[PDB]
Amino acid sequence: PYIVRLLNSSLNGCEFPLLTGRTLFVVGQSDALTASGQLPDIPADSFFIPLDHGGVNFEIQVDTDATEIILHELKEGNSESRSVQLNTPIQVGELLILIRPESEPW
Amino acid sequence: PYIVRLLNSSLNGCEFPLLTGRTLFVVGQSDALTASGQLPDIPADSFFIPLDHGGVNFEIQVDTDATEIILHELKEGNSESRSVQLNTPIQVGELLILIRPESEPW
Amino acid sequence: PYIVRLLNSSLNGCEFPLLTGRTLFVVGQSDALTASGQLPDIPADSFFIPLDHGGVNFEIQVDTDATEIILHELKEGNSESRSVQLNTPIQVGELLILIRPESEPW
Amino acid sequence: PYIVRLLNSSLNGCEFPLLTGRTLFVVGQSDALTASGQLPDIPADSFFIPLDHGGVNFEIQVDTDATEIILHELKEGNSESRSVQLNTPIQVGELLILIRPESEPW
């Protein structure tokens, strides 16, 4: 299984497990934060990351084979996708994240 | 495992264990101090160091192999990295620190 | 292990054990005295010495090999170091101290 | 072990044991007397001797070998030392003292 580690922001060092399938990361201010509590905490498929500006919401898709990891950067009325690699800084908006195997600490 | 020892500041002689991965050191005044209590004390990945001026926040990254230690000096909108050596004074801003093996007292 | 003995001041004859590593001596008036109580009394790495004038803060560094003893005299924005010898008067500011082995009374 | 015996003053005949190392004798008026009670009575390394004028503070240093006895006469910003002999009147300021072995009464 894979883990998203924040490399910057006020939550630098936070690590969020990923579930097979798609996981949403809402990145922004308190308006999004307080509005994100409307969905249950069942096997988390979404997370909120505070970021004072330049935040961009994104989704990380992990296939059932776990041989490819796609990151969907969400934009107005659309999304853009890219393939990402493990153990390397990934910049989404002003947020810097790293996706690692659970067994390979960063 | 490695330990950060402060060589100056009002906490001179304080020693902070490092965990595999990244550890944040917030260095500054009371605004940062009282605002740093918003995150839990779970296996500490962050520390606050008081310093009346010239403080610079930084991160110490310890690889899982423990064969290289990187120090990321945080700057506005960016960070600068450098490799550091054990048992030698390291200057970050006006702060002077030393990174040592747990078994090698300074 | 080594012991610092004061040879002058109002605490003349006081003896302070040294721990492997660095020990801070704050030397000055009551402003420093009452402000020095903000850190815990865990294995003391700091001490306060009253001195009506000419006091200078310093650190005594004892290596893990105990084959060299360095005294860091603290100055504004910097420190100066010197190697010191056992069983001899050492002048730091107006303070006169002596560093002796625990087994060799002065 | 050695003993200091006062040969004059209002405490004439008082005998004060000496400990290996340095012992302080504060000699003066009531200002010094009432200010001398700020240190604990642990293995005494200091004593107060009343003397209406000409009092001079001094220290008696007894080496661990007990083969030499040094008397440090304290002066402003400095001290002067001299070697003293057992069983003979020693004048410090207007105070007259005698240092004797514990087994040799005066």
Author numbering:
A (entry chain X), B (entry chain A), C (entry chain B), D (entry chain C): 14 to 119
Give verbatim lines from the article.
The major structural scaffold of the basal body is comprised largely of three proteins that arrange into a series of highly oligomerized, concentric rings: two intimately associated proteins localized to the IM - PrgK/EscJ/MxiJ and PrgH/EscD/MxiG, and a third protein belonging to the secretin family of OM proteins, InvG/EscC/MxiD (Salmonella enterica serovar Typhimurium SPI-1, Enteropathogenic Escherichia coli (EPEC) LEE and Shigella dysenteriae nomenclature, respectively). In summary, we report the crystal structures for the cytoplasmic and periplasmic domains of PrgH and InvG, two of the main basal body components of the prototypical Salmonella SPI-1 injectisome.
To validate this, we engineered mutations of the PrgH residues corresponding to the proposed phosphothreonine interacting residues in MxiG - Arg35, Gln42 and Asp65 - to alanine. We therefore conclude that the PrgH cytoplasmic domain is unlikely to interact with pThr-modified proteins. We note however that the FHA phosphopeptide interacting loops in our PrgH structure are accessible on the cytoplasmic face of the ring model, suggesting a potential interface for protein-protein interactions. Indeed, deletion of this domain results in the formation of secretion incompetent immature basal body assemblies lacking needles suggesting a role in the correct assembly/coordination of the inner-membrane export apparatus.
